[model samples]
Target chain A: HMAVEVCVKAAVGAPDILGDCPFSQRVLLTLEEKKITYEMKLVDLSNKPEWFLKISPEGKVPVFNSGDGKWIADSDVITQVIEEKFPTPSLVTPPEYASVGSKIFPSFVKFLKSKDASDGSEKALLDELQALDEHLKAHGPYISGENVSAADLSLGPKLFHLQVALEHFKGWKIPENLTSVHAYTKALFSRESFVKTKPANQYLIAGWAPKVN
Target chain B: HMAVEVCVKAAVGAPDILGDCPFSQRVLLTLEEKKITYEMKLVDLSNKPEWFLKISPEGKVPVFNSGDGKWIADSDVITQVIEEKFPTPSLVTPPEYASVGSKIFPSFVKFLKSKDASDGSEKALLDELQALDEHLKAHGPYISGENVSAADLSLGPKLFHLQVALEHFKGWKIPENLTSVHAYTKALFSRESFVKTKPANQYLIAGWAPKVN
Candidate 1:
């Protein structure tokens, strides 16, 4: 058993497709920040194996094999364990409230997926982005104002995907109304936490090609 | 602020309809089992008000108003919170391996939606059900056996929905392939938990109801 085994789907940039790819980036962000050495085992989501069934019977990716023999599936649940076990430079804010982000972040993502997003989803996203923009403007760095909490990690991947969604799905353009979120992600892209943590020099659309074994 | 103020869409007997409208029943089950008490404000999901938007933001029903100033909108989150904050009799198995029921629970519900499930999804659900069948056959009595947890609460509502899917959607009948799960729900339906936590005695098709004041 390894200290931690990150199970993800084998797709190009499979390790970091953000939202739909089960948001596996959360696991990557956590491990990188904690300086934890771990192995990544990519499973073909279409044809997962018996052991995958043993660990995450749900067959979801980003299942953490914690080596103690306890497997934690679900990105949210996996974060809970990391916070509890590692706890240094902690990513979660108000420990219990950590789970709250799980719902809010995803709700916004689904909203973006809506076709009538002109008035429905895109509008909703802009509305949320405005709120986040104002908060960021007031705070002057991070959404929570520079601490780099788990919420930041949760929101980070979504930011990456929003760009992907806009580019990939022409029907889903980020309206000019979403100026706030556009500017916010641009600003976020400038930060050290995000810049270093981001999969730079690589494109998520192409899939992950790790330099190290 | 009250300990609990639930905004419910009270459609008589609807909870039993399975997928139609079991959201309210999900919360009610947790509340009833936990013995948490408070106000049940009935609302028409169709005619949602400013408060619903203010409280739930998404303006969805089954919002658990904690009166303490914290409001929860999503049913799954509320169910988990209720199980955690007011945990009694342990609805989920030990935190280390809660997947016992969660594993099958979603797949069970997925099985219903699955009659209409596309190629990949349908196969995934079937594979999951097969896994559950094996687990239950090897384990026994409830998801964890001997003790029923939140997995049961989560699954019961789903089972209720599956039955409805069978009734409402034609062409794809609930297969005898899921014998173990079928037996489990039958036994569950008779249990004190299922009998009481069952949804309102009405059938709810859409996700929302008329707005309430």
Candidate 2:
């Protein structure tokens, strides 16, 4: 197996563990789920390194480097490369499921920023969750059915943010009626890999403090 | 060969052909390059059909449907499906190249909207093109090495728009000194697939008419 190194944003004061950055978390989750051993190089985004810019001109987080020193930026691209390079425990998701999966986080973001004028974004978020619930109901336990796939890994962090941040800031809870979504969330959270890799809820809450108040 | 159906935004006045919509053009370019026969269903954005909503609730254009009636939305996802489902004449680009390929259009958009203020977006776009030029210099005639890949198809329309719209409205050209970029542009524009699938230059010019004086 090729040695893997990932550059990620440190969680506020916590330098050793994962952060609230969902994209970084997605790459970490992929590594954890795939049982890929790796090193994490945390960059304080406020002061990115000169070397980092050489790898990622945009200075984005979650840049991946292979054992041979080949590098790629962008969380989506990094995850794809990781999947392709380490084909053992495949993280591939059906393009359809991945497409549907991509919408949830953006909808959640819109819901977070929505005002009472209600651009119907709140409904849009729920509708998406409901559709996801239906998918999980048929293809249970995971977003892409049967085995946990890249779609689930990609979504796990955003759902965590949605569940934690929204509830922390707005006193909102994911509707209990979304049983499948709730059940799927529980399954993902209960996994050994997710449990091992996830940053603490307090750290996640602290990460969102500036955005809320 | 699964029968493919694609929903796209019609050229403002022409209902039977592709338009300057970049997302739709990306999918069309993929299909054309892969020699995949597809049915084009034009959607007038001002009056989207009710059935379209069922397939794509957000009413986005360029929805893809397979012969089995499996439907997916999002241009990125659709192109991935096309690349995977028809692996012949593979369009897979290196993840690094694809990541680099995505930055040019948004930079071009910013450059287009930036007037006399010169927000440095023009430089940003040029920097992106220069990087592309260097990449082509090293790996000529295409964005992802020798053969055209999804990255090339994805960038083709935006570059076309950039080349045409910027020249037509702003009288700006991709620097003549950037010979590799110019050569790559000529090579892509000369392909039979791109030639057959592209929106007419007039339609392209007309599409940008509203944005320019």
Candidate 3:
């Protein structure tokens, strides 16, 4: 009768807006893409609520309220469930494309957190980004090609975080020649669904402040 | 038509058998369960051949050679492709169950790699194991209830590694009180697919040697 409930990470300083977690945005993107309205909760995470703690002792965000007050954690699980429960606007990408850009988040985080500029973390992140660029050039427009499939939903937020975080901290950007990645990323950010769920740059920068130093 | 070709990591000392990679075994389990016969190449990661490097520029193991010479890395993608290609003996678990025991491997690895005796890594692992136990008590003979699914295949191999690595390194075991986890792990260890893909304990220990110290 009503929309599902979801708990997402709050911006570290601004609890009203969303957090900088790419994973949380991935789930939010999935929900919005599916046309599934969800009651969103922004958890401070630093100080969790009793109700949240009661349902989710693990206290992970992007937790889906799977009817009956029961909650499920992990964006992989949450997105998969939402897709299964509402399959009309199918976000199912080909199985092969499911993990596209999966490594980019971790690689970006390592690179962002690295104090040593010469460490291979930058190279690793570049390698992953390069692969994405190649894939988009061949497959085109989106990771799943033409449609914003689960792969796109998952990868888009990470790309945003990678773009925002790297540029803010290390004066980095997805290299100039990676045209397809650039276009693909811009389109993802501009999508109507993304616009609705997008957090401010100030909050995003603040969220990552403690992480970098 | 011949079955697909896959490259898995070779045992550290013995280049014939499989290495101590849980990811490789996950793909192997998926293939075996689906009755897909395949060629297995054990790549000596320390001394990689040109052929291996040519096929996998990233030089990652558990690489799947899809029809044509295109190789895909990451067990998550490999298994998903296999499941889609051969839908029979479907290892698809419900979305919610897909991540069951997913954290155990990382937790176990952290615990195993921790030099400090008082590190909370051990407790983190125990928490994951305990959750699995509770899960088994309710909705599982396997992670997907009666039949083994993709979740079980992925988790089973990691559990083997966790078991072997932790016991060998820390003289630790899954708490005996977690009866369901203990039983579920035993059944997984005894599965026919696992028996076929299993690596020796000696190799597993050797694989983590450099990683630990």
Candidate 4:
């Protein structure tokens, strides 16, 4: 068993299916799945403490203070640090080697928070999605070929956001377009580890994703 | 000398920075300084080419397809890939742990592009600069402490905007208030790489930053 550490915000929404947001969920679920004993601290993001601020120079949420003072800030970066330093369950693809599963993390982040929104935000999102769909169509299997890896962990919230927003915005049932992608999200999100970590009470989906028009 | 590869918009602005927008002079100058051999691809970011889109999968510019096909998008990532892989007579920072030097790249981007209404688009930029000023005050001399790094590469463009925008807005003078930062900017901006990389015939201070204001 490993000693894991994580930081998260107060319970805000969807404790069962969407709790802890993306950053905290990644670490918590991984630790719980591994049955690794861990500790968590809830931070008020607006009024940050000096200790938290020092570790995460960027001052972004979900900073990970790995044992031995190595702190990681970006949510994705936190996931990666955990994957690298600990390897019992093997959560990541080998570094520098391409994995369909591992690639999904980056793909989803690009779709959700991309800085380029010109030519309409929908088109921007669709452009990112098309590429993802094509990749799944080509692979038609697990992200890491047959097993789950950090990719699903990375893709989780972003894909969930995309699915929910697409349905709510269109006011119609959204097709589970990428068959493989759907299966991927389901397999990962439904895990006891994931369910326990991701509460149904919180929302990580971007505010603009739901369109009134 | 290194074999650096760059993907950029042949035209300025839009997808030129990230598959749209024109802000890739940093890499270009780095390559030229090292007399490194490099390849360039002019991408149309809005409707990105399949290959470019596939590399980033985000349809963004500044995707570096490091000859071996280990792709990294985001200008900062490209800057880092180059600094780490090459490292001789270093383009941005020292040979060891270039990622440290590259850490500040995001803050620099956020600074130039941040906006405020009363003072105009330079508000966030100034706030970042003030934070940077405080950082310097606490940890003196160079941003990296006694050495320049990829962090320095982000400075030239940043200061150019600061100088031009401060002058244009007439709200406050950065140099007068934050003297050391101003001096550092003056010194860094005067470097050969900076002079060559800066805007030759455009309004260096423009209203595209902080997107909201």
Q: Pick the candidate with the highest DockQ.
A: 2
DockQ of each: 0.08, 0.11, 0.09, 0.06
In candidate 2, what are the lDDT values of residues A105-178, reduced to their tens digit?
88887877766645888788888888888888887778777788887888888899899978977777779898
Worst 10 residues of 4 chain A by lDDT: A11-20
CA lDDT, every model vs. true structure: 0.58, 0.77, 0.81, 0.53
Q: Tens digit of lDDT per residue, candidate 1, span A1-213?
A: 447788766554343332235267767677777777777666666566777777777677777755555555666656656655566766655323333324435545556445453546556555666666555566535555556666667777776766654554434544555454556566656655455545432354343222111
Best by TM-score: 2
- Write down the TM-score for model 4: 0.53
Q: What shift in Å separates residue A53 of candidate 1 from its native position after superposition?
A: 7.8
Error of 2 at A66 (Å): 18
Candidate 3 C-alpha lDDT tens digits along B1-213: 445899999986567878888889998889888988788989988888888877776677878865545466667767766664567987877656766787888888788879887898988898999899999999988987988888888888888888888888889988889989888988888989899898889889998888888
**Between candidates 2 and 3, which one is better according to lDDT?**
3
Better of 2 and 4 by DockQ: 2
Tell me the lDDT of model 1 at B208.
Answer: 18
Q: Per-prediction TM-score of chain B? A: 0.72, 0.91, 0.95, 0.61
User: Across residues A1-213, which tens digit of lDDT does each residue of candidate 4 receive?
Assistant: 333566665444322233335656666666665566677766655566676666554555675655644344555545544544455787654232234334333544344444454625555455555565666566534455566666656566556655654454443222467565666667767877766666442243333343232
- For model 3, the superposed segments whose C-alpha errors exceed 4 Å read A1-213
iRMS per model, in Å, is: 7.3, 6.4, 7.9, 8.4
